[PDB]
Each structure stands twice: as C-alpha cells, then as structure tokens.
Amino acid sequence: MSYIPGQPVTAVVQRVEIHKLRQGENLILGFSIGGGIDQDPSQNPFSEDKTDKGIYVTRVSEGGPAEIAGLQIGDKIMQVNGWDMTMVTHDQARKRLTKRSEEVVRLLVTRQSLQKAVQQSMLS
C-alpha cells in the first residue's frame, strides 16, 4: 500500500505560490515556461486538445523561488493567482505573473509526481 510505481497519477492538482525575487528594481523568479513548446498557431481552432493551450514549465531557477514554493521541471500551469490561464493569452499570462500587484503567483498546476531527479526522458 501507499505509492505504487508504474501507475500514472495523471495529474496532481496542487496549488503553489511562487514569488518573484529580488534583482534590484526587479522582482522576478528566473524560471522558464513554455506555452507553445511543442505546438503552433494551427491548433487553436481546437485549442490544441480543447482548453489545452499547451502551458508547461520547461525549467526552473533552481534553489530559487519556484521550486521552493513547490515547483519543478515539467509542470503544467493551468492558472495563476486563481486566474485560469487556459482561456487567456500568453501575454495576458505574462501580465499577471509579473506585474506589480502581487509578490507572488499562486498557481494551479498539475504534477506528475516525478519531481526533480534528473530523468532524461525525450520522445519526439
């Protein structure tokens, strides 16, 4: 009982508040997210796979803000500060991740449970 390797958890829905970090006048996190990583404009007639949008963290400023909040490499961010990113645009998303009204972005993300352990899994 308790944890069974080989069985997909599909998507762990967890909330994580990741806060931008001090770089002088800059408050920023320094991790990277892909909204488009493996896609194109041509899917939007369907939104990729319906409401997909293809938003997924592809890196992290390690030992920094995101990951300490509870973020890691390979995470699908669905919303920030409670703002469903799926129906909104990447620039719109950019706005509410890094404006001057927060100090932190509260995320609705989807975990695989396969956190940082450097697993080289690459399939094209």
Partner: peptide, 8 residues
C-alpha cells in the same frame, strides 16, 4: 496557441 516560451 503557438510556440512561445518565456522566463519570468
């Protein structure tokens, strides 16, 4: 929708 990534 399309390929665009960003650090923040």
């Amino acid at each position: 929708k399309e390929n665009l990534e960003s650090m923040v």
